[PDB]
Each structure stands twice: as C-alpha cells, then as structure tokens.
Write a protein that holds these residues in place. Sequence first.
Motif, short mmCIF file in Angstrom:
data_model
loop_
_atom_site.label_atom_id
_atom_site.label_comp_id
_atom_site.label_asym_id
_atom_site.label_seq_id
_atom_site.Cartn_x
_atom_site.Cartn_y
_atom_site.Cartn_z
N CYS A 71 -41.01 0.07 0.80
CA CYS A 71 -42.22 0.58 1.13
C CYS A 71 -42.32 2.11 1.45
O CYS A 71 -43.18 2.83 1.13
N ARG A 72 -41.18 2.29 2.44
CA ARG A 72 -41.18 3.83 2.76
C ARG A 72 -40.71 4.81 1.54
O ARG A 72 -41.31 5.63 1.66
N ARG A 73 -40.07 4.26 0.73
CA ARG A 73 -39.67 5.06 -0.55
C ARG A 73 -40.90 5.28 -1.38
O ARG A 73 -41.18 6.46 -1.95
N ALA A 74 -41.89 4.22 -1.78
CA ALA A 74 -43.00 4.28 -2.30
C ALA A 74 -43.93 5.25 -1.68
O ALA A 74 -44.69 6.22 -2.23
N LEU A 75 -43.96 5.22 -0.16
CA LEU A 75 -44.93 5.96 0.35
C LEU A 75 -44.57 7.54 0.44
O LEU A 75 -45.35 8.41 0.48
N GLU A 76 -43.14 7.81 0.22
CA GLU A 76 -42.81 9.12 -0.15
C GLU A 76 -43.38 9.69 -1.48
O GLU A 76 -43.41 10.97 -1.60
N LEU A 77 -43.53 9.05 -2.25
CA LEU A 77 -44.01 9.26 -3.63
C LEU A 77 -45.51 9.41 -3.94
O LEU A 77 -46.28 10.17 -4.41
N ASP A 78 -46.34 8.38 -3.07
CA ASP A 78 -47.65 8.23 -3.20
C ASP A 78 -48.09 7.96 -1.80
O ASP A 78 -48.29 6.80 -1.45
N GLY A 79 -48.74 8.94 -1.07
CA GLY A 79 -49.16 8.91 0.13
C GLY A 79 -50.45 8.09 0.27
O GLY A 79 -51.05 7.57 1.48
N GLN A 80 -51.16 7.78 -0.85
CA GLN A 80 -52.43 7.22 -1.02
C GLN A 80 -52.54 5.82 -1.26
O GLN A 80 -53.56 5.04 -1.44
N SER A 81 -51.32 5.54 -1.49
CA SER A 81 -50.92 4.02 -1.98
C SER A 81 -51.68 2.87 -1.06
O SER A 81 -50.98 2.54 -0.11
N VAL A 82 -52.63 2.36 -1.58
CA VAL A 82 -52.99 0.73 -0.98
C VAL A 82 -52.07 -0.08 -0.66
O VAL A 82 -51.77 -0.45 0.16
N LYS A 83 -51.49 -0.38 -1.92
CA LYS A 83 -50.31 -1.45 -1.93
C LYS A 83 -49.07 -1.21 -1.26
O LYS A 83 -48.57 -1.92 -0.57
#
Length: 132
Positions: free
Chosen positions: A63-75
């Motif tokens: 989840c942290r890796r995803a958030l480093e790529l897309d800070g607007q991610s609901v998921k």
Amino acid sequence: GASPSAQELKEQGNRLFVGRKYPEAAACYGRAITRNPLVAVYYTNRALCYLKMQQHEQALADCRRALELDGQSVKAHFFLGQCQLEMESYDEAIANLQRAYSLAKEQRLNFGDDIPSALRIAKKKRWNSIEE
Ligand SMILES: *CC(=O)Nc1ccc(NC(=O)C*)cc1
C-alpha cells in the motif's frame, strides 16, 4: 516461449485472485512489477492477495508503494486502513478510511455504502478495544 507484457500478467493475476489462488496471484503481480514498477494497481492488487494470505506487513508495504505513485488513490488509502485495522492500529486505520471516503467523493466514485460501512465497523472495533 513467450513472455507476457506487464498488462498481460496483471490480467493473469486478476484471474488467479478470482480463482482463490492468492500466493500465485501475488507472484504474478510481482512479475508484472518486474516489467513495469511504476503502475500503482499492481501493488494494490498484490496487497489484496497478501491480506487474503493474512500477511499484513507485506500488504502494508505494498500500500505504501502504491501511495508513492498515486497520492490520490482511494483504493490504496482504503486498503492501507484495512491493513492497519487488522494490525489493531485503530486511529491510523480510521483516518485512512476517512481519507478514502473523501477522495472517492472528490472523484465521484460509487462504492455504495462500502466505505461508510467500513468506517462504522472500524470505529466499533476501536470502541470495543477501548472498553476492553
Ligand atoms: C471482474 C472481477 O474480478 N470480478 C470478481 C467477481 C467476484 C469475485 N469474488 C471473489 O473473489 C470471492 C472477485 C472478483
């Protein structure tokens, strides 16, 4: 032989998840990441596999890796909260679920009542934890 595209391996891991083969699905998403590590959904999809496998730390890191790529991610915010909830990090979990809810409204994404329900459940689990 043939080697798939990253997109093709994501599709295959998706089918493996629906087939309830979660360690296999997770490895498929890792193979997609090898081809293209700049795609947030590969990490969030793998985090759902890790959650089904009860591997909360590994899910949390994705989840942290995803958030480093897309800070607007609901998921990513939603499943970060779910990882934290499973780990009994209640206040962090609730804030991330509330951030997921706000982002989903900003983006006009319809998940029915899933996010409000997830919050109510999170707050009740937190309350029970406090009342012992
Ligand atoms: C498109 C897609 O992936 N749909 C879908 C339907 C049902 C489920 N159910 C379970 O995994 C238990 C997952 C995905």
